[PDB]
Amino acid sequence: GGTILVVTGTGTGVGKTVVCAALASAARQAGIDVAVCKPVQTGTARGDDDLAEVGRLAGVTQLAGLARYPQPMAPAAAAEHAGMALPARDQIVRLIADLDRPGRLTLVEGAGGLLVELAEPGVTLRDVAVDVAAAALVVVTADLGTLNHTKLTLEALAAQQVSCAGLVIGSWPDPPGLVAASNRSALARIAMVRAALPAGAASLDAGDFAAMSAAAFDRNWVAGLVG
Amino acid sequence: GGTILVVTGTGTGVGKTVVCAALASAARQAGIDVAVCKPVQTGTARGDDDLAEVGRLAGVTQLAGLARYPQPMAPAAAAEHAGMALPARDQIVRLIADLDRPGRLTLVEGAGGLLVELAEPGVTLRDVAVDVAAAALVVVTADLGTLNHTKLTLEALAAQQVSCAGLVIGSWPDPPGLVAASNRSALARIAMVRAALPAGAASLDAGDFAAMSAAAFDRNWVAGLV
Ligand SMILES: O=C(O)C[C@@H]1CCC[C@H]1C(=O)c1ccccc1O
Numbered sequence: 001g002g003t004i005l006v007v008t009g010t011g012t013g014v015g016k017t018v019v020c021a022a023l024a025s026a027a028r029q030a031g032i033d034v035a036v037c038k039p040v041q042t043g044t045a046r047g048d049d050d051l052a053e054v055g056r057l058a059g060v061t062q063l064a065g066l067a068r069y070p071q072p073m074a075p076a077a078a079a080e081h082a083g084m085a086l087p088a089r090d091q092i093v094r095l096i097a098d099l100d101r102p103g104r105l106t107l108v109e110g111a112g113g114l115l116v117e118l119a120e121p122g123v124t125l126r127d128v129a130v131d132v133a134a135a136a137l138v139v140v141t142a143d144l145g146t147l148n149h150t151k152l153t154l155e156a157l158a159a160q161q162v163s164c165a166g167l168v169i170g171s172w173p174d175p176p177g178l179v180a181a182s183n184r185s186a187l188a189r190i191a192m193v194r195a196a197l198p199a200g201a202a203s204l205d206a207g208d209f210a211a212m213s214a215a216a217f218d219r220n221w222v223a224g225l226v227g
Numbered sequence: 228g229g230t231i232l233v234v235t236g237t238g239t240g241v242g243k244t245v246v247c248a249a250l251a252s253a254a255r256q257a258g259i260d261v262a263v264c265k266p267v268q269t270g271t272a273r274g275d276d277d278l279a280e281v282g283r284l285a286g287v288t289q290l291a292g293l294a295r296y297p298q299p300m301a302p303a304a305a306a307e308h309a310g311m312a313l314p315a316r317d318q319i320v321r322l323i324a325d326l327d328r329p330g331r332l333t334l335v336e337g338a339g340g341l342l343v344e345l346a347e348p349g350v351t352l353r354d355v356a357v358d359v360a361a362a363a364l365v366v367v368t369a370d371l372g373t374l375n376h377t378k379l380t381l382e383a384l385a386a387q388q389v390s391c392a393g394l395v396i397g398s399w400p401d402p403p404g405l406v407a408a409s410n411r412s413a414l415a416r417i418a419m420v421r422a423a424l425p426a427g428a429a430s431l432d433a434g435d436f437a438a439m440s441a442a443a444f445d446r447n448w449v450a451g452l453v
C-alpha cells in the first residue's frame with residue numbers, strides 16, 4: 001500500500017477540488033506518483049466534473065470515478081431524482097484499494113462535507129477513511145463561521161479515530177481583512193494549516209497553477225506524505 | 228427549577244435570534260413566563276442587539292446579558308481586538324441559574340455555532356448547556372449543506388450527553404425550491420422539525436409576528452415544555 005488521504009471540507013463550496021489539484025501538483029513536483037479518486041460525483045447535468053477539473057489544472061492522468069448523478073444536490077437526493085441507487089460501501093472501498101500502491105499518494109475527494117451519505121446505508125467519507133485507514137485533509141474557508149464548522153469537522157474525525165492530515169484554506173483573499181486574518185490565526189491553534197490557496201486559483205493556466213501549487217505547500221510536509 | 232433551553236445554530240446567520248423570539252412569543256401565548264439570556268453579544272458597533280429584537284418581536288421583558296463587543300466577529304476575536312477578556316464560565320452559569328424558576332422557560336442564546344468560545348477558558352455553549360442541565364435546540368438553514376452541518380452539530384451534542392430538543396429551520400424560502408424541499412424532508416429523518424419560519428419574518432411588526440409564531444409551532448409541544 002501507499003498513502004491515502006481523503007480530502008473533505010467544512011462544507012460545500014470550500015474548494016475541495018482545487019485543493020486536490022493543488023496537492024496533486026505539488027506532490028508530482030516532489031516526484032511523487034499521484035492518483036486522484038472521486039467516488040461520488042453529482043451535478044453532472046450542470047457540467048460539474050471534479051476529476052476533469054483536476055486533470056485540467058494539475059495534469060493528473062490517473063483519475064478514477066464511479067458514481068455520476070445529474071442534479072447538483074446531495075448524492076442521496078441526486079440519486080433518487082434519477083431513479084438511481086448509491087454505490088455500495090465495498091464498491092467505493094474496492095475503487096480506492098485498486099489504486100493504492102507503494103510510493104503512491106492517492107487522493108480521495110469527498111462530496112460536500114464529511115458526514116454526507118456517499119453509499120448505502122448512511123456510509124460517509126469518514127467510514128471510508130476508517131476502512132482504507134486513510135487520514136483526512138480538511139478544506140476550510142477563511143470566512144465567518146469557519147471556526148465552528150472546522151471544530152465540528154475535526155471533532156467528528158476524532159470520534160472515529162481518523163487522523164487529521166491538516167487544514168487547507170481553499171480560497172484566501174489578498175489583501176486580507178480583519179476577520180479573515182483573525183480566523184487564519186485561530187485555525188493554527190486548532191490544527192496545522194498546510195496551505196492557503198489564492199482566490200481564483202482555478203483560473204490559473206497549467207504553469208501558473210503548478211508554480212502556485214509548489215509555492216502553497218511546505219515541500220517537507222508534502223515530501224513526507226509518502227514513503 | 229423550571230425549564231432551560233439553549234438555542235444554538237449550525238452556523239452564523241441561520242436565524243438563531245428570530246427562532247428565539249418566535250418560540251418565546253409562542254410560549255408567552257401559551258401563558259408561559261419566558262426569559263431570554265444572551266450572555267455575549269457582538270456586532271454592536273453596527274447595531275446588533277439580539278435581546279432587543281426578542282423584546283420587540285415577542286415582548287419578553289426578562290432580557291439578560293453580560294458583555295457586548297463592537298466588532299461583528301466571534302466573541303474571542305472581538306475580545307482580543309477590543310482588549311478585554313470574555314466573561315467567566317461562572318458568571319454565565321449563575322446568571323442562567325438565577326433566571327431559572329418554576330413555571331419559566333429560560334432560553335439561552337449562544338453566539339455563532341455550538342462550539343464558538345463563549346467564556347474563559349475556552350468554554351462553549353455546549354459546556355454551558357451541560358453545567359445547567361439544559362437541552363439544546365438547533366437552528367438550521369434549508370440550503371445545500373444543511374444536513375452535514377446538522378449531523379455534525381447533533382454528533383457534537385450527543386458527544387457530551389446534551390439532549391437535542393429538536394430542529395427549527397430559521398428561514399423557509401418562497402417559493403421553497405427543489406433543494407430546500409429535499410432538505411426539509413431529510414432533516415425530519417435525523418431529528419424532529421419543531422418549526423419552519425417563513426423568510427422575512429424578522430421584519431414583521433409584533434402583532435403579525437406573534438400570529439406567525441402561534442402558527443409556526445406545535446401548541447402541544449410548546450405547552451409541554453414547562
Ligand atoms: O463537492 C462539492 O461540494 C460540490 C458539489 C457540486 C454541487 C453540489 C456539491 C456537492 O457535492 C454537495 C453539496 C451539498 C451536500 C452534499 C453534496 O454532495
Ligand SMILES: O=C(O)C[C@@H]1CCC[C@H]1C(=O)c1ccccc1O
Pocket residue numbers: 144145146238239240241269270275299300301302337338339340343
Ligand atoms: O451570533 C451570530 O451568529 C450573529 C453575529 C452577528 C455579528 C457576528 C455574528 C457572530 O456572533 C459570530 C460570527 C462568526 C463566528 C462566531 C460568531 O459568534
